[model samples]
Target: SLEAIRIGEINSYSQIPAFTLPYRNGWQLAVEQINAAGGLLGGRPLEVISRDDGGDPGKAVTAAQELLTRHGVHALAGTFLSHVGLAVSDFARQRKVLFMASEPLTDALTWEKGNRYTYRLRPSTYMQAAMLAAEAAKLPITRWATIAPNYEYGQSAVARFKELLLAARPEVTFVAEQWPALYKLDAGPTVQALQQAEPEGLFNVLFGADLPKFVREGRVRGLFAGRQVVSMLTGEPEYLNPLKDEAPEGWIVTGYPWYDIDTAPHRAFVEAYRARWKEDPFVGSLVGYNTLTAMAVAFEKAGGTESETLVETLKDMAFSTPMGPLSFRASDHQSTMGAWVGRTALRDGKGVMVDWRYVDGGSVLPPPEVVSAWRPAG
Candidate 1:
């Protein structure tokens, strides 16, 4: 059907609806707006065929295969979980499909395990962790503890956070570490263990349901008292909103403060998104919208979505997102997208970000020479 340019999108929608629900709305809104505004490639409508990975890597690979082989999508995009993202990424490499990874944060996707076929949009765990580490090093606290889901994403995040924190503050020491199973946190024991460690600061990578559970349990047990925390993605409305009045305060995190951003591009995006969905956006919402926005520009830039042509077109490709402009790096296939770093606080009985600043991905990323050394040579 020449009338529509179809693309495949897979995400852990069923596993994490708090994030993926708004995320789904975002991409759907993008598809609608693009088609309404003269479509793309001389009036060919943008069409997305999306799937749920159930947060399973194997299921994600199967979905990727089906989308490419049966549905015949022009290119592939979207995946939330790092393991699932990697599975689909490797599949793209084996099958020679161009994949735009939307939300996976593991640094390995664009570093050690990076391939020509996979390009990632969100800042990697390494980048975001480095952002937090910089701020954390300025704190008076030294002894630290960590609690993260035990998987590639969690392990990579904790390791990178510690590495960067240590580099910035050589005296920093990790007094305790907790690895709860992804999405299945035992909050009581986890909180108790960290409390027993008696660290002055905490580094957290848990999100989804695990985050709130930990927050509740830790607060009840007085684990968070007097402890400075640097957490990942905790300020995003998806995770923070769920806590409502229970939201932890004063923790430094990387997230979107949708209500506060006043930039022209962001305001336009917020208006359109609200007009379409009738709901406030989440960080995932921005990611979803930006993913398709980038893809649309790539499709137009490539002149069509032939796999190799699209890959080459995406290299150093500049496109506008709600957060302003971003470009994919030719060196590592990682987008120069950044995140907002802020402290969490309660306002009007709900969680909000305070003292926020947008940290550009370009600045947080390691030098190209360092990244190039981590990847396979062409």
Candidate 2:
């Protein structure tokens, strides 16, 4: 009989504690509830050993090796940044280990660089961009300026949004493109460059500190007054909370609307987190909690820890979370976890998604043939 099941968690804690800590809290809650309910497979308690990747790819690989060889973890989970996730996902692919990526938003994780050993929980950059692009196509704007960070997440977001939006609105033309160094923005100059473009609309992927910096300067310079901005990840609590009342008034974004979701599953998750952490659940918390739950449900459904069993069970499984029922796609191992899509507005003196509705991943996901095209078998 197995003594215990170990799942290794890796993330960029050194760079993003504001989001990572809440994520940790969410999984810890899952573990506690799981253990209390009699643990995994005949009292073999599930446990997670975590390591900080320090936002470095090489370090993420080293940490993955440590988790597998040194700690003997049965599976892997967790990551915040895109590059870090790609490094660990590649490690899993090369080693043929089960890896469920929790928070990385890169499209390539489940697309071009995708492999059998890896599954991802969050909506990809392309997925979220598609959600926003659907809304953007309805707008009257014919010219758009795109601005995003110089990284995988930003580049992929911009590229995918362009593909989807122009496919529907072929008359639209991209006027200018701006690439700001991630988290190292010169906000004044960046806003000025965008102003000079004078496009009817803008698409942004910059998040974290760069989000606020750009918004503050853009508002002061009247850059956003007359232009529509369709942004990525701006609705997530980690990035939007800082803006508070200053959050963009009508920007279309994909985010977590913790305050507005009234479903029973979501309410329970929200209340539980608030009771335990004495704080509201951030978007990362949703991802983190769901990640462990997915692992537990997969293991139970598979009835064993064999690699093939785990992978197959993950493909077959659909489970509920604060977000709702979701599962990994059989073709791609990309989870059907959806995201909140709507306009940004301040509610109760805090930034929240308004006119918002939950956009189910299934409704917006690419068809099986497209997914097959994204990951053609050898």
Candidate 3:
């Protein structure tokens, strides 16, 4: 029995265009691929109703309400920023609608503040940092310094990295920490702050244009000459392409190792995505396509767009993605699949990984008992 399923997607299209554009393209491809494959739930076409949230929490809330009440969407998904995701999560809970969060990486969305209505497809901030820290902990470095943008995403990343790295290497201590405001550049002061700490290693969380500026400034100041550096989201084409030869080499990072994974599934996806977009896919695109694919699976299993059934189907379900098998933890509805982590190196004049390994999200995830501590009383 095929019934048309209406799904609503909301994302920030204008603000942080570089970050959200790939997600838009990824989902578009997924929609096309799913429809080409005879649709979901036997023959019901998956219809996506999209609205721009302008990267605002208030607008995201309004968009969610509009999609649920006015447009009659059966499922809600999309939200690039953590605050926006939380806003939509609250709205979904209040409305009793199913929400498949695609890109917000804040841990609170799935851990401390999660509800039955909210399900996150992408790994949260804690997960990504844990993946990077696990390898860094085994290294010879002892003293460490961190610089992340000051916000929910940044603070959570630093806090989680500290906790994980300390647990693995008790001798490691943070000598300095810097919280730069997002998208703002004060490279001189920031560089000076880190240099003064004189730590053996540094962990960076800046991305986009800010990263290039930081790298250029760090190079000029010799801040990275002897210090080991690790960063998040810096090895991707979007960030590296701009730096070219100037892109930092030998930094540990967490990103989509497109060429390295070499799985048939990923190869096929990379080829198709590159052929269509005429550009290589980034982490966001992978997240976008995988999220859509997961939703399609959920819709199929539910046999319709009924929210309650779809929610039940998604819990504890395993789905194939470009990366590999991903399972939504039944306890928290967060995807328990891992991400790629490795030491950053320059390959053929391009920034990439040297000795990398995929960290399974399931292996590093806090046990249900630990997660239960964060949940509030019903």
Candidate 2 accuracy as lDDT = 0.88
**Candidates 2 and 3 compared by TM-score, better number:** 2
Kindly give the stretch of ten consecutive residues in candidate 1 with the minimal lDDT sum: 369-378
Q: What's the lDDT for candidate 1? A: 0.92
Which residue segments of model 3 deviate by more than 4 Å? 1-3
**Between 1 and 3, whose lDDT is larger?**
1
What is candidate 2's CA lDDT for residue 155? 88
TM-score of 2: 0.97
Q: Can you rank all candidates by TM-score, best first?
A: 1, 2, 3
Please write out the lDDT profile of model 3 over residues 298-355, one tens digit for every residue: 8887877778888899888999887778899877788976777777777788787768
Question: Candidate 1, after superposition: displacement of residue 363 in Å?
Answer: 0.8
- Superposed on all Cα atoms, the candidates' RMSDs to the truth, in angstroms, are 1.0, 1.3, 1.9
Please give, for residues 98-157, the per-residue lDDT of candidate 2 as tens digits. 999999989899888888888999889888988999999999989999999898888899
State how far residue 346 of model 1 sits from its true place (Å). Answer: 0.9
Q: Write the per-residue lDDT of candidate 1 for residues 1-378, one digit (tens) a residue.
A: 556899999998888998899998998988888999989989999999999999999999999889988999988899999988999999999999899999998999999999999999999999999999999999998999999999999999999999999998999999999999987898898898998888999999999889889998898899988889999999889999989999999999998899999989999989988998899888888889989999999999999878999999998899988777899998888999999999999999999999999999999998887897899776
Q: What is the lDDT of residue 141 in candidate 3?
A: 85
Worst 10 residues of 3 by lDDT: 369-378
